[PDB]
Amino acid sequence: SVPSQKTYQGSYGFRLGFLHSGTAKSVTCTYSPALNKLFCQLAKTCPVQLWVDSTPPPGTRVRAMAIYKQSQHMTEVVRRCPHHERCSDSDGLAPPQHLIRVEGNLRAEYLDDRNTFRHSVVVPCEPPEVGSDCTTIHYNYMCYSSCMGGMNRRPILTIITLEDSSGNLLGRDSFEVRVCACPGRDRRTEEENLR
Numbered sequence: 001s002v003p004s005q006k007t008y009q010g011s012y013g014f015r016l017g018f019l020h021s022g023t024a025k026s027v028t029c030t031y032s033p034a035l036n037k038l039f040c041q042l043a044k045t046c047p048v049q050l051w052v053d054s055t056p057p058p059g060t061r062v063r064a065m066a067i068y069k070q071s072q073h074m075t076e077v078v079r080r081c082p083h084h085e086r087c088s089d090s091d092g093l094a095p096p097q098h099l100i101r102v103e104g105n106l107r108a109e110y111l112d113d114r115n116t117f118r119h120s121v122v123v124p125c126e127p128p129e130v131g132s133d134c135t136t137i138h139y140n141y142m143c144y145s146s147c148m149g150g151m152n153r154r155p156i157l158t159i160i161t162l163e164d165s166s167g168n169l170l171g172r173d174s175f176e177v178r179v180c181a182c183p184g185r186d187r188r189t190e191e192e193n194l195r
């Protein structure tokens, strides 16, 4: 009924990392460590780093899935709103209903779960480029948090899972997401509210 959100580094020491983009009104994606919350604009690039202590086996994959954060909504499938699922902004791979896309990876696969009806997007693990210490996946979020008939101002979490070739759990991390017009201002506002 509800995917686990328990942080689990597992055998390979799996965890996420985020850039330090600041909170200028012009910023398009910015992460708050104090809130564990990513703020981003609609359909803009969200770089998410993958870090490990040791190399996972060939065939390991990384999956992203959104769930509602509030318990009274957690059994509801997170999907694009009635407007955005029909706006024909397909990239040729992502189903138009899916909130989360992976950008610039032809090996991305999109799953509609046959039992839970939840959406996810999964990519193969690839080693860092020479000179880099981590691998970065570029995600896009294809609806605003405020979209009527969709997320409708309800907070969501993105759950990132490291999986073996059969889909068994190897590692898990997560972060809250707000998709909004002004991520810099909203991050500043929410961090102030927390303080």
Ligand SMILES: O=C(O)c1cc(I)c(-n2cccc2)c(I)c1O
Pocket (backbone or CB within 6 Å): 050, 051, 052, 054, 055, 056, 062, 124, 125, 126, 127, 128, 133, 134, 135
């Ligand atoms: O240093 C390595 O050998 C390495 C290998 C892999 I495969 C990955 N990875 C884990 C998830 C996606 C890529 C990473 I992050 C690494 O640092």
Ligand SMILES: [Zn+2]
Pocket (backbone or CB within 6 Å): 080, 081, 082, 083, 084, 085, 142, 143, 144, 147, 148, 150
């Ligand atoms: Zn929408």
